[PDB]
Ligand binder design. Sequence first.
Ligand SMILES: CC(=O)N[C@H]1[C@H](O[C@@H]2[C@@H](O)[C@H](O)O[C@H](CO)[C@@H]2O)O[C@H](CO)[C@@H](O[C@@H]2O[C@H](CO[C@]3(C(=O)O)C[C@H](O)[C@@H](NC(C)=O)[C@H]([C@H](O)[C@H](O)CO)O3)[C@H](O)[C@H](O)[C@H]2O)[C@@H]1O
Ligand SMILES: CC(=O)N[C@H]1[C@H](O[C@@H]2[C@@H](O)[C@H](O)O[C@H](CO)[C@@H]2O)O[C@H](CO)[C@@H](O[C@@H]2O[C@H](CO[C@]3(C(=O)O)C[C@H](O)[C@@H](NC(C)=O)[C@H]([C@H](O)[C@H](O)CO)O3)[C@H](O)[C@H](O)[C@H]2O)[C@@H]1O
Ligand SMILES: CC(=O)N[C@H]1[C@H](O[C@@H]2[C@@H](O)[C@H](O)O[C@H](CO)[C@@H]2O)O[C@H](CO)[C@@H](O[C@@H]2O[C@H](CO[C@]3(C(=O)O)C[C@H](O)[C@@H](NC(C)=O)[C@H]([C@H](O)[C@H](O)CO)O3)[C@H](O)[C@H](O)[C@H]2O)[C@@H]1O
Ligand SMILES: *[C@@H]1O[C@H](CO)[C@@H](O[C@@H]2O[C@H](CO)[C@@H](O[C@@H]3O[C@H](CO)[C@@H](O)[C@H](O[C@H]4O[C@H](CO)[C@@H](O)[C@H](O)[C@@H]4O)[C@@H]3O)[C@H](O)[C@H]2NC(C)=O)[C@H](O)[C@H]1NC(C)=O
Ligand SMILES: *[C@@H]1O[C@H](CO)[C@@H](O[C@@H]2O[C@H](CO)[C@@H](O[C@@H]3O[C@H](CO)[C@@H](O)[C@H](O[C@H]4O[C@H](CO)[C@@H](O)[C@H](O)[C@@H]4O)[C@@H]3O)[C@H](O)[C@H]2NC(C)=O)[C@H](O)[C@H]1NC(C)=O
Ligand SMILES: *[C@@H]1O[C@H](CO)[C@@H](O[C@@H]2O[C@H](CO)[C@@H](O[C@@H]3O[C@H](CO)[C@@H](O)[C@H](O[C@H]4O[C@H](CO)[C@@H](O)[C@H](O)[C@@H]4O)[C@@H]3O)[C@H](O)[C@H]2NC(C)=O)[C@H](O)[C@H]1NC(C)=O
Ligand SMILES: *[C@@H]1O[C@H](CO)[C@@H](O[C@@H]2O[C@H](CO)[C@@H](O[C@@H]3O[C@H](CO)[C@@H](O)[C@H](O)[C@@H]3O)[C@H](O)[C@H]2NC(C)=O)[C@H](O)[C@H]1NC(C)=O
Ligand SMILES: *[C@@H]1O[C@H](CO)[C@@H](O[C@@H]2O[C@H](CO)[C@@H](O[C@@H]3O[C@H](CO)[C@@H](O)[C@H](O)[C@@H]3O)[C@H](O)[C@H]2NC(C)=O)[C@H](O)[C@H]1NC(C)=O
Ligand SMILES: *[C@@H]1O[C@H](CO)[C@@H](O[C@@H]2O[C@H](CO)[C@@H](O[C@@H]3O[C@H](CO)[C@@H](O)[C@H](O)[C@@H]3O)[C@H](O)[C@H]2NC(C)=O)[C@H](O)[C@H]1NC(C)=O
Ligand SMILES: *[C@@H]1O[C@H](CO)[C@@H](O[C@@H]2O[C@H](CO)[C@@H](O)[C@H](O)[C@H]2NC(C)=O)[C@H](O)[C@H]1NC(C)=O
Ligand SMILES: *[C@@H]1O[C@H](CO)[C@@H](O[C@@H]2O[C@H](CO)[C@@H](O)[C@H](O)[C@H]2NC(C)=O)[C@H](O)[C@H]1NC(C)=O
Ligand SMILES: *[C@@H]1O[C@H](CO)[C@@H](O[C@@H]2O[C@H](CO)[C@@H](O)[C@H](O)[C@H]2NC(C)=O)[C@H](O)[C@H]1NC(C)=O
Ligand SMILES: *[C@@H]1O[C@H](CO)[C@@H](O)[C@H](O)[C@H]1NC(C)=O
Ligand SMILES: *[C@@H]1O[C@H](CO)[C@@H](O)[C@H](O)[C@H]1NC(C)=O
Ligand SMILES: *[C@@H]1O[C@H](CO)[C@@H](O)[C@H](O)[C@H]1NC(C)=O
Ligand SMILES: *[C@@H]1O[C@H](CO)[C@@H](O)[C@H](O)[C@H]1NC(C)=O
Lengths: 317, 317, 317, 173, 173, 173
Amino acid sequence: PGATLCLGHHAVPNGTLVKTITNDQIEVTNATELVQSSSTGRICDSPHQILDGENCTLIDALLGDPHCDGFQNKEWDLFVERSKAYSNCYPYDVPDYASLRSLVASSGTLEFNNESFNWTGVAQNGTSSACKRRSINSFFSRLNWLHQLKYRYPALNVTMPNNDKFDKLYIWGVHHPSTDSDQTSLYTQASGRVTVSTKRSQQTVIPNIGSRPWVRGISSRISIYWTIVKPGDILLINSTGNLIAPRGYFKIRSGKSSIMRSDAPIGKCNSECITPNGSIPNDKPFQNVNRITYGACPRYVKQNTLKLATGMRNVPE
Amino acid sequence: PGATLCLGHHAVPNGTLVKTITNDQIEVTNATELVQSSSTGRICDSPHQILDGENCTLIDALLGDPHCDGFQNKEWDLFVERSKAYSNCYPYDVPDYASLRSLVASSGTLEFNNESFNWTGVAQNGTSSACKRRSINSFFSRLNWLHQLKYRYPALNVTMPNNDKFDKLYIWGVHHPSTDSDQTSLYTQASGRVTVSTKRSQQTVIPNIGSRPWVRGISSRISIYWTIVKPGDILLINSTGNLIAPRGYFKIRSGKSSIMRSDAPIGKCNSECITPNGSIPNDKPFQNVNRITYGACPRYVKQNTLKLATGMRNVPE
Amino acid sequence: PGATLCLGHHAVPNGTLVKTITNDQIEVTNATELVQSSSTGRICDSPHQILDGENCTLIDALLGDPHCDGFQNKEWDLFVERSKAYSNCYPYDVPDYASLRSLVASSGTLEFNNESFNWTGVAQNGTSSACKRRSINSFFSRLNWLHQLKYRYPALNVTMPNNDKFDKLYIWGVHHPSTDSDQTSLYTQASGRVTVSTKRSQQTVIPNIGSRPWVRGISSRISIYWTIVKPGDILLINSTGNLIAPRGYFKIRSGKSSIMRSDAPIGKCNSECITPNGSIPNDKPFQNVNRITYGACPRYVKQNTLKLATGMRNVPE
Amino acid sequence: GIFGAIAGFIENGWEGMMDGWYGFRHQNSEGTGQAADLKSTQAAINQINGKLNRLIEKTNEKFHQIEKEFSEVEGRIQDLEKYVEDTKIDLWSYNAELLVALENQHTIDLTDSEMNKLFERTRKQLRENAEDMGNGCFKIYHKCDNACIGSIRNGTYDHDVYRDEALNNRFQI
Amino acid sequence: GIFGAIAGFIENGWEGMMDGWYGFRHQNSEGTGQAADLKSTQAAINQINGKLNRLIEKTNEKFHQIEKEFSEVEGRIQDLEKYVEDTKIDLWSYNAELLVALENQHTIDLTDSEMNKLFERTRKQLRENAEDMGNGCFKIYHKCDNACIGSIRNGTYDHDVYRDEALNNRFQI
Amino acid sequence: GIFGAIAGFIENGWEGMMDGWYGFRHQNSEGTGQAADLKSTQAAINQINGKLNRLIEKTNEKFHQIEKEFSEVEGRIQDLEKYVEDTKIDLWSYNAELLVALENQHTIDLTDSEMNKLFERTRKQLRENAEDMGNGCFKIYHKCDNACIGSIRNGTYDHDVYRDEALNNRFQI
Ligand SMILES: CC(=O)N[C@H]1[C@H](O[C@@H]2[C@@H](O)[C@H](O)O[C@H](CO)[C@@H]2O)O[C@H](CO)[C@@H](O[C@@H]2O[C@H](CO[C@]3(C(=O)O)C[C@H](O)[C@@H](NC(C)=O)[C@H]([C@H](O)[C@H](O)CO)O3)[C@H](O)[C@H](O)[C@H]2O)[C@@H]1O
Ligand SMILES: CC(=O)N[C@H]1[C@H](O[C@@H]2[C@@H](O)[C@H](O)O[C@H](CO)[C@@H]2O)O[C@H](CO)[C@@H](O[C@@H]2O[C@H](CO[C@]3(C(=O)O)C[C@H](O)[C@@H](NC(C)=O)[C@H]([C@H](O)[C@H](O)CO)O3)[C@H](O)[C@H](O)[C@H]2O)[C@@H]1O
Ligand SMILES: CC(=O)N[C@H]1[C@H](O[C@@H]2[C@@H](O)[C@H](O)O[C@H](CO)[C@@H]2O)O[C@H](CO)[C@@H](O[C@@H]2O[C@H](CO[C@]3(C(=O)O)C[C@H](O)[C@@H](NC(C)=O)[C@H]([C@H](O)[C@H](O)CO)O3)[C@H](O)[C@H](O)[C@H]2O)[C@@H]1O
Ligand SMILES: *[C@@H]1O[C@H](CO)[C@@H](O[C@@H]2O[C@H](CO)[C@@H](O[C@@H]3O[C@H](CO)[C@@H](O)[C@H](O[C@H]4O[C@H](CO)[C@@H](O)[C@H](O)[C@@H]4O)[C@@H]3O)[C@H](O)[C@H]2NC(C)=O)[C@H](O)[C@H]1NC(C)=O
Ligand SMILES: *[C@@H]1O[C@H](CO)[C@@H](O[C@@H]2O[C@H](CO)[C@@H](O[C@@H]3O[C@H](CO)[C@@H](O)[C@H](O[C@H]4O[C@H](CO)[C@@H](O)[C@H](O)[C@@H]4O)[C@@H]3O)[C@H](O)[C@H]2NC(C)=O)[C@H](O)[C@H]1NC(C)=O
Ligand SMILES: *[C@@H]1O[C@H](CO)[C@@H](O[C@@H]2O[C@H](CO)[C@@H](O[C@@H]3O[C@H](CO)[C@@H](O)[C@H](O[C@H]4O[C@H](CO)[C@@H](O)[C@H](O)[C@@H]4O)[C@@H]3O)[C@H](O)[C@H]2NC(C)=O)[C@H](O)[C@H]1NC(C)=O
Ligand SMILES: *[C@@H]1O[C@H](CO)[C@@H](O[C@@H]2O[C@H](CO)[C@@H](O[C@@H]3O[C@H](CO)[C@@H](O)[C@H](O)[C@@H]3O)[C@H](O)[C@H]2NC(C)=O)[C@H](O)[C@H]1NC(C)=O
Ligand SMILES: *[C@@H]1O[C@H](CO)[C@@H](O[C@@H]2O[C@H](CO)[C@@H](O[C@@H]3O[C@H](CO)[C@@H](O)[C@H](O)[C@@H]3O)[C@H](O)[C@H]2NC(C)=O)[C@H](O)[C@H]1NC(C)=O
Ligand SMILES: *[C@@H]1O[C@H](CO)[C@@H](O[C@@H]2O[C@H](CO)[C@@H](O[C@@H]3O[C@H](CO)[C@@H](O)[C@H](O)[C@@H]3O)[C@H](O)[C@H]2NC(C)=O)[C@H](O)[C@H]1NC(C)=O
Ligand SMILES: *[C@@H]1O[C@H](CO)[C@@H](O[C@@H]2O[C@H](CO)[C@@H](O)[C@H](O)[C@H]2NC(C)=O)[C@H](O)[C@H]1NC(C)=O
Ligand SMILES: *[C@@H]1O[C@H](CO)[C@@H](O[C@@H]2O[C@H](CO)[C@@H](O)[C@H](O)[C@H]2NC(C)=O)[C@H](O)[C@H]1NC(C)=O
Ligand SMILES: *[C@@H]1O[C@H](CO)[C@@H](O[C@@H]2O[C@H](CO)[C@@H](O)[C@H](O)[C@H]2NC(C)=O)[C@H](O)[C@H]1NC(C)=O
Ligand SMILES: *[C@@H]1O[C@H](CO)[C@@H](O)[C@H](O)[C@H]1NC(C)=O
Ligand SMILES: *[C@@H]1O[C@H](CO)[C@@H](O)[C@H](O)[C@H]1NC(C)=O
Ligand SMILES: *[C@@H]1O[C@H](CO)[C@@H](O)[C@H](O)[C@H]1NC(C)=O
Ligand SMILES: *[C@@H]1O[C@H](CO)[C@@H](O)[C@H](O)[C@H]1NC(C)=O
């Protein structure tokens, strides 16, 4: 009577479709997904140091907008800028705003050392009702509004040598008065000038008198500029008027720090990968949640889904 | 006597050479070409909206050079700039010419709404023999040359709020007179000034008196600048002289629009892919016709040809 | 008694580990390395034309710093900038220093033709003790320091047409005096002005009086700018003071030329590929010596090593 | 498909085999059975796990990069920032598509390979005592109870012991 | 080449077979014939068409990009614009070269695979009535007229019907 | 591994074979021998050299590019220059990893393929005079001195000459 011996393989009733070189739909017994396409909806506060900007932009924390006084000297791995943030100090603009935001974001610290500049000849500590600290007229914490003293504004000439091992980041400004009377009242001269320089570079700004669309009580503006002083170099500030002076320097590092725009809430969880949509798991090699990521993340791709066959071809009975 | 049964495969006398992992020349029975290397020589006017610039650059159509008056308010999917184009109005230059060209090209429309600016105090509608409309002295259609009125040029201060849902693109200029007498004759003051600003930004230009290489009757120049006003924002223009004022704004969209340099003629045909050499078919995945493309195109590669084997190895009898 | 015939394959006692699709360590009989990870330590002076900058930056050779006089009119395939280089002429800065360095490096030549500019009205050939040639006060070889003549500095107006087939590169400057007396002594007017222009462009510079950190005897500065004049175009220079004038133009080509920062010594050898670490062999397709290369080089990758199996799987006895 | 076994000369799989990927199904005088082969099942699973380990959690750490959303029109620099990013995404999208296509084609071929290996292992074991029926089944020309089937699966089957009996049945007239 | 049939133990192809890619050539007492096998020919063609469909007309739509030709010397920004584009072209050029190399190697291997599959299909069909001559030809040890050849090609050949006759010729002395 | 010969039904390699990659090891009445097969050894070596020639010294000439080290903080433009370069390096790093992985998997499979081809070449040559022992060795059922072994290796072995003798030993009882 003999015997028969049959060689075979398994199969399933619920196979999965995958793509190959020769076929864009072939059924295998099992597959796994390679594109992360969902987020938790919240930014995990671990393992990275998250700084929730809340009502404050990074720039406004840097300058020292009064409602941003809490951010002084903080560090961060990732600074999260909310869309609800607002400015509530003296109206300003920043030539190359983007570059200043990126270099500070990249540096990852708001550490600020104060320095004693010799402003003999001018009054200091000018204030305004557009910038209040507990109802009292005030100004940017890190900036010093210099104005006339007994109706005189001499030619200022002040030096600050960097004798440290690190770079110094100096933030300074220029007042653009709305009216000629405002110019002469504040700075006496008919038009000011500001020159901040080092051994290697120079920046000279001529103020522009004239009103600007009214913003929060003011029709003048302050333009913001920055200067990096290397070790062995010297900061040289000159002014015949309109100088918004720095009160010191910021440390400027290089690290793994950055800044992200997102309104995703912060949660108590652990996740290496951060998107503006919230944290995502990094178990898969690809993701199409967001082209903006931070940390150990799957790489962004256009595809919804990419199924990797984990089993043989499926041939049901 | 039995029988013999032979298993075999086909072959051809005219095989093709292909590359493999292990061999850069092996003969197969048949192959297909994957690099598109020829063009029709003409740009197909379908399915995309082609705007033949002819004698006009995009900028000159934007500004309203008289021989470009026909392009007013036109839209385009692809604007084609010919090398034969010329400028035939008042000589000008544009700081960041490239950025203005790209943003308008990208926006894809020359739509222009006129707006009533209050220029009380100055004469309007200045003209020149370098810019003629039917033999008559004229100027850029979209620009308004303001000059003195009864030997006086007051401090202009005009506002234009953007209360619409869309962005507004304003194009404006500054006259740089050849001579000091030309300056005082046109604008009365010894030197002018122009400040266009919004709530968020500002641009202040001081004119420069002095001749420039003679171009088409003139040795002065007009510098061209632009300003984008967001919804809820306000355009603020100030001048104590030399302001070339806008007569309104351009709509500024985002779309699939762009601009290409080519002297390939326009034809009546249908082709998705456009190169400066003309349209090419997009049946192949690669092409080496031009690194500049527009539309659904094969991807540019350095290779002349890439033969994909469509048959077995060829072994002739 | 019959016979037995066994089919088999070879093996070795010292196999190599390689990676595959399914396995990151599998032993094969032999392998070859695909990542070049070592350099000779020296830059081979062949087959490329190497210009050892030694003590001179490219810019200082361009301008004509006295200790860089030897580099006049030299060409190069690769200019090597040493970290020991120093400036020993009048202190200067260059707006867009990087772009000027790149365009000259790319052009690959210091060829300089002299041209006869009509500077009637001013004294020429100003000198300084910060820039000495054989102990004698001198200046940049390619620049002409114009100053007053009999206490008068008229409005200069000089033209130079490019009637050649090639482009002309003009390098010129602006003196920023330390003191107002220095300004009036040198240039008579209370403040200068410089306007270099062509048919297509213009650059106007207002000097800034005021001291700068002391560098090598001087507290004033010279700002360096450049202008490219096309064929059929005309160079137009205007000055009412402080003009540092060019003595001619540089030829500006396009070629395979570039510039590299390295302190690797030059050797007598032949090597196609140059890195800042020195030449490397280009037999392998990949390298992780440096992301900065010049010539026919393996492509940079992050990996130390990538072993290509050149033999079957190894199964020892 | 490259060896023609799975979805080839084997008409379909066995939904009832749930302890392995490859196995045996026999019929003799004592009855009918099904048992999974481990060495070939483990061989396919280990290869597929090898692929997964080369892909799962090997990600890239990136920190400060470039901006990728913009609130203003800016022109030349913004165009290049968008172009750089759009170029990068397309290239990684391509890498992803090809990776999955290549891996899946190989996964199907290696599972077909492992099926054939088991078929060939059995065929050489049975020597001249059996004949390939062409559909993945061998006809065994001798008495082979369950202990005899077990020796084939286990690899302990002495073909000499049954050769005379099978040769007689194979070459009968 | 991976199965050694095409350009291996088959010395050359048949330029005369023009209705298929794989086929049969027989000689018996009634004469000599040639007929193409469809299932293996269709199997190779369908796989190659599958490749083509994954490549043909799947292109990318791009609109406004960056400038790629320049009339002036500009320096830093122009260098980066040229570098970005030169980098992109090299990477897609590489993708193109590898794609064609990989696909062609696989096309040669899968056509070799399909040849072997047909050879193996026939070999199992003929059971113990035939012997592999080693050059892709089987020696059939019995009377096999054209209707008998046709049943082999068609897959209707009952080997039992000729077994006694072939076994006698195979094992004669 | 895709054919199951190397590191499969062949238990290990021969460290003593130093004139070839594939070969023969025989035992008969005259003694025991080892000789390398050239056509299969040359076939594997030529394929592997083909790979190398497609990779070795095919490099890219680049001249003036972008700066890739920076002494100052600059922001937006420097970020994009770093990003462009970091993106390029990651993509070529990926190309390098996949290239080596793919090539090595294929090198192992093609060497396994060439082993199987030699095994199959021999098996068809021996016709019905021999039987596959299952471990890469054939049992030869007749007197086969060294000149007889040599004819097998050389491909001159007339199986007809020994068929009667082998058939008698194969089907003895
Ligand atoms: C220093 C001062 O009080 N300036 C005000 C100016 O006073 C002139 C006076 O100095 C001069 O000698 O004589 C004339 C005629 O007699 C003036 O009286 O007058 C301007 C117009 O009336 C004022 O502008 C008004 O300022 C308001 C609030 O101003 C503050 C502010 O809160 O922003 C007060 C601050 O202390 C002051 N800062 C400093 C450092 O002194 C600032 C600053 O002057 C401006 O903000 C800069 O433009 O002003 C309202 O904002 C009101 O809308 C505006 O018209 C001058 O304040
Ligand atoms: C407004 C005017 O006519 N200006 C001309 C100027 O007239 C001076 C006069 O205004 C002043 O009070 O007294 C002195 C001495 O008595 C002058 O007479 O004189 C210049 C030199 O002679 C002229 O330059 C000449 O302009 C020519 C053609 O000029 C136009 C033009 O077609 O471009 C006329 C236009 O109407 C005018 N635009 C406006 C808004 O009025 C322009 C404009 O002034 C200039 O184009 C700007 O530089 O000029 C030729 O171009 C000739 O080559 C040139 O010397 C002043 O036109
Ligand atoms: C032209 C000249 O000699 N200027 C010096 C200036 O002389 C003034 C005089 O011209 C004016 O009429 O009357 C007053 C009062 O009587 C002055 O005497 O005085 C300055 C301050 O004393 C000098 O600055 C000093 O310059 C030193 C060396 O100067 C040179 C140099 O080697 O750099 C000499 C060069 O010939 C000169 N260049 C030209 C084209 O004439 C330069 C140039 O003036 C400056 O470098 C630009 O700032 O100066 C030392 O450097 C010393 O430290 C410094 O105080 C004027 O040199
Ligand atoms: C389809 O194929 C997929 C992919 O091959 C397959 O999914 C895998 O299943 C394994 C085993 O069930 C999963 O392994 C688990 O992974 C988690 C971490 O993610 C571990 O913590 C788990 O550990 C438990 O088991 C261990 C056994 O040794 C213990 O040591 C440990 O303490 C825990 O008890 C567990 O190993 C693996 O995560 C998935 N992989 C993926 C990518 O999903 C799946 O089984 C197949 N589908 C079907 C229906 O068969
Ligand atoms: C070498 O290999 C190539 C690639 O495999 C092969 O070329 C292909 O041939 C087919 C069939 O001849 C072509 O198909 C045609 O495509 C056009 C559109 O481009 C269709 O419009 C055609 O349709 C006609 O036939 C249809 C049949 O069903 C009808 O439905 C229809 O109404 C028309 O009558 C036709 O299908 C295909 O375009 C090419 N592909 C390429 C890439 O060239 C070629 O045959 C091989 N060479 C040799 C010498 O054998
Ligand atoms: C592991 O595999 C590697 C790679 O396959 C293998 O290395 C290769 O060996 C060959 C032959 O020994 C080397 O070829 C040499 O290359 C140099 C140039 O680099 C030539 O100048 C040499 O020429 C000599 O020999 C020629 C023979 O025709 C003569 O014509 C000539 O005049 C010279 O006498 C020589 O051909 C090759 O360079 C390496 N390749 C690599 C990438 O290293 C190696 O053999 C294997 N390892 C082991 C231990 O087996
Ligand atoms: C130049 O023109 C601008 C625009 O008209 C002038 O600014 C305008 O100034 C008036 C008052 O001088 C503003 O009205 C004020 O509005 C606030 C809140 O909206 C209100 O609380 C005040 O009581 C007052 O009514 C007007 O809004 C403002 N416009 C803008 C756009 O800011 C500017 O003063 C002019 N300059 C000169 C020198 O004429
Ligand atoms: C500063 O120098 C420039 C260059 O010399 C002066 O421009 C030059 O001016 C003269 C006339 O003043 C031009 O000649 C004219 O040419 C046209 C056509 O070519 C001709 O039709 C006229 O009749 C006249 O002859 C000369 O070409 C022109 N050069 C350039 C390059 O434009 C400029 O006027 C000087 N400025 C001062 C204040 O001196
Ligand atoms: C504005 O302030 C700066 C900084 O104090 C002034 O520059 C300084 O000027 C003095 C002399 O006027 C310099 O001293 C000199 O140093 C050299 C070598 O170091 C020495 O050989 C000389 O004999 C002299 O002692 C001082 O170093 C210098 N500081 C810097 C940073 O350059 C500048 O003059 C002031 N301007 C005005 C108008 O007050
Ligand atoms: C993650 O957030 C992004 C950014 O908001 C989402 O992408 C946008 O989706 C809107 C509509 O849903 C589109 O119109 C935009 O074009 C998208 N933005 C960009 C920059 O392309 C994305 O859908 C979110 N994904 C998840 C999974 O939450
Ligand atoms: C399509 O047009 C391009 C651009 O003109 C051609 O490429 C140029 O060819 C010239 C000489 O023929 C070369 O010197 C240039 O280097 C090329 N330009 C660039 C930017 O590389 C191209 O040959 C044309 N191709 C077809 C098929 O018409
Ligand atoms: C080639 O030179 C480069 C540049 O100096 C070396 O790379 C640097 O190595 C230091 C420490 O050795 C690191 O801290 C830097 O991060 C590296 N630079 C960059 C830009 O990444 C490299 O090690 C040298 N390689 C060889 C083989 O000499
Ligand atoms: C374009 O310019 C040329 C020469 O100026 C002229 O012949 C042609 O008619 C012009 N075409 C248009 C549409 O203006
Ligand atoms: C085969 O192995 C199994 C597992 O240990 C065992 O239960 C069975 O008795 C074995 N049979 C034979 C015939 O070796
Ligand atoms: C085989 O099939 C063909 C096609 O229908 C038919 O003409 C022929 O008669 C068949 N022969 C046999 C033996 O089945
Ligand atoms: C096989 O070939 C070798 C090499 O030429 C030769 O020495 C040997 O005699 C040959 N043997 C036979 C049996 O053909």
